Amino acid sequence: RNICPIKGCGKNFFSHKYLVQHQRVHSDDRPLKCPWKGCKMTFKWAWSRTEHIRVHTGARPYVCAEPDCGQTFRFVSDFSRHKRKTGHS
DNA sequence: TTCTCTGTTTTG
DNA sequence: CAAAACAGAGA
Ligand SMILES: [Mg+2]
Ligand SMILES: [Zn+2]
Ligand SMILES: [Zn+2]
Ligand SMILES: [Zn+2]
């Protein structure tokens, strides 16, 4: 059990290493930056930054493999929701 | 609806 | 292992 000390947080984590990284939730630094030209967005989590760049490019890399489905997604959560909903993969 | 945040899982 | 990615929730 690795429990967060702070405030009215106190949730526990599968791991101690993640408990340490979790602390960025209760700090205000947003050290990751958007590499797009003159976008001022900043982040704490690298995955947010990765998905975010697709708003700039328009990409839709998540492609449903179900025969004849044909659907594509910009964001992994959406792709997971659709599999969940539908049963594809 | 689009998208970001984050705890856990997968990949390398 | 650490980094990348997922899956879920929900702003
Ligand atoms: Mg920039
Ligand atoms: Zn906490
Ligand atoms: Zn940006
Ligand atoms: Zn599908």
In a domain, A43, yes or no: no
Broken C–N links (> 2.5 Å) in chain A, after residues: none
User: Strands, DSSP E only, in A1-89?
Assistant: 2-3, 12-13, 32-33, 42-43, 62-63, 72-73
In a domain, A89, yes or no: no
Resolution in A: 2.2
In a domain, A80, yes or no: no
- Number of domains within chain A: 1
In a domain, A11, yes or no: yes
Q: Quote the domain boundaries for residue A19.
A: 1-29
Q: List bases, strand C, within 7 Å of protein CB.
A: 2, 4-10
In a domain, A49, yes or no: no
In a domain, A7, yes or no: yes
DSSP 3-state of A10: coil
Which amino acid is residue A83, in one-letter code?
K
Q: Using what technique was this structure determined?
A: X-ray
- A:29-68 Cβ neighbours of strand B under 7 Å: 41, 43-45, 47-48, 51-52, 55
In a domain, A82, yes or no: no
Q: How many Å lie between the centroid of ligand 1 and the Cα of residue A45? A: 16
Spatial separation of the C-alpha atoms in residues A71 and A64, rounded to whole Å: 6
